[PDB]
Subunit: 229 residues, 2 copies
């Protein structure tokens, strides 16, 4: 009767349970720790930023050495003095209060995204593709995990850069726009005469990520709006 | 009796599930401790590299400011002389430095490209001659991210510390791929002057927690060679 029923049901239920626990032991012993791997990816994004910062610094310093060289070869002490007072004393001083003044890549306060854009600016500079950065306001935060935000931005700039190679007098423009409601990443490039799948995957698994495209008179636009939580 | 059995069964399945549930919980704790070690290890490593790079950058900007004397004295002859003798050669060393970094393009394992570039920048800014050779693209290495990363780091950090004392240091790095496996090699010039024992005790600990990683994978073969005055560290990682 209902004792036997319930007792037989019990030995069944406990066997199911024993099965699912045996599966959880097996997953924890043998499948990859997704979380530990995500910590490792996030670490790689930091060290890429650090590497790309030091490369930009080397590129920048070489240009300062070129400029000084030129002044010296022109025998132009007035210019050298003016340039040193205006560019190299401030660089040495390195005052925080001069942060209110800086309005370009210097206002991107997410270290990992700043390094990533620094790399794309350097890649473009190698291939004689001019690249403007418009970040009028400081951008301290973006409501997307670092891994997806990183892949998204890099693919959009990879598109722009590949598209700029088959062209005379190209240009790429980049902007970060903060409202009260969202952060918006825009990339425009000049067009010729007319991967990106993993990017659509990301926008479709996020309700706050709106991916937009525009063809506007001999230049292509990619836009990502990210809404605050 | 028949029924005394099921009552006996439920008892013994409940006991089994208890033990399993203790196992799951002990493994969740082991995984938790591991996530923690990985986060603090890698967050400390970022701090030490970030602070080293800043120092390098500080030295660079200091050098620019040694021109200040010459400018205030309105002395262009002393500037031209000082610059063309002390400062301007940096820009050649920096252009060569940028060229050597193009040696890493064939590394298509994003997992470790940042790690390797960072050791190369570090060696370059310590004025240790370094080259990297990857004759064919390498897009797949058959060892976990974390252990590959720890192995590479130890070997490159060993080659770099051992190179700071020496008069003419060289480090050579390579990734080669057969169709069988991938091999990672770091050659560095052995020192002539051997350190006093007391100026070395508080690499050898790190070489053993490298053997740790090599022993606990059958498909990774570690080799340590001395050959014509070079320490060679080879790690072969088979696609078995």
């Amino acid at each position: 009767g209902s004792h036997m029923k319930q007792l037989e049901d019990k030995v069944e239920e406990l066997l199911s349970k024993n099965y699912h626990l045996e599966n959880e032991v097996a997953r924890l012993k043998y499948k990859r720790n997704q979380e530990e791997i995500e910590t490792y990816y996030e670490y790689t994004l930091k060290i890429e930023a650090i590497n790309n910062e030091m490369r930009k610094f080397r590129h920048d310093y070489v240009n300062i050495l070129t400029t000084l060289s030129e002044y010296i070869r022109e025998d132009d002490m007035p210019g050298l003095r003016d340039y040193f007072n205006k560019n190299i004393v401030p660089m040495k001083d390195n005052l925080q209060m001069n942060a209110i003044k800086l309005n370009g890549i210097e206002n991107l306060k997410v270290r990992e995204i700043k390094g990533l854009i620094t790399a794309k600016i350097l890649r473009a500079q190698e291939m004689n593709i001019p690249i403007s950065i418009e970040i009028p306001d400081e951008v301290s935060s973006i409501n997307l995990n670092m891994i997806d935000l990183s892949r998204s931005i890099g693919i959009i700039l990879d598109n722009a850069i590949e598209a700029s190679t088959e062209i005379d007098d190209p240009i790429i423009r980049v902007a970060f726009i903060e409202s009260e409601n969202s952060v918006t990443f825009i990339v425009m490039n000049k067009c010729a005469d007319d991967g990106l799948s993993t990017l659509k995957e990301i926008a479709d698994n996020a309700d706050n990520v709106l991916l937009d495209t525009i063809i506007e008179n001999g230049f292509f636009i990619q836009k990502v709006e990210i809404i605050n939580n």
